[PDB]
Amino acid sequence: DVFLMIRRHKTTIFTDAKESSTVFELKRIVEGILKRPPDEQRLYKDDQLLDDGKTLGECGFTSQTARPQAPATVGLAFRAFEALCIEPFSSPPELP
C-alpha cells in the first residue's frame, strides 16, 4: 500500500499502488487514465530516472516513506523523453 502523486505540468494524478509491483502496469494505468500512447511515459523520482524493472516500493519510496497524508512527488515526462517541467502549487497567503 504505497501512495503516489504523479505530476506533469498542471496535471496531478493520485494513485494507490502495492508494496511489490513493477511500474509497467503503473504506466499502463496512467495510459488508461491519460488517453495518450503508453510509450511516452517516463517517471522521475526527484530529478532521477527510475528503473522500469524495479518495483516502485524498492525504487526508493516505501509505505512508511510515502504516507497517504503526503505521498511521493514522482514526476511524469512524455517523449519528445522531454524534460520535467512540473508546475508547483501556489503558495498559501501569509498569515498576519
Partner 1 sequence: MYVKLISSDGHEFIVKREHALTSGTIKAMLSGPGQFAENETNEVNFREIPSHVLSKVCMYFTYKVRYTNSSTEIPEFPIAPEIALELLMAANFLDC
Q: How far is the CB of 67 from partner 1 (least distance, A)?
A: 7
Nearer to partner 1, 32 or 37 (CB): 32
Nearer to partner 1, 53 or 89 (CB): 89
Q: What are phi and psi of 32, to 5 degrees?
A: -65, -35
Dihedral sign computed on CA atoms, order 6, 71, 90, 47: negative
- Site residues for partner 1 per CB under 8 A: 1, 3, 5, 10-14, 16, 32-33, 35, 67-71, 87, 89-95
Nearer to partner 1, 51 or 82 (CB): 82
What's the Cα-to-Cα distance from 1 to each of 6, 32, 33, 37, 65, rounded to whole Å? 16, 21, 20, 27, 11
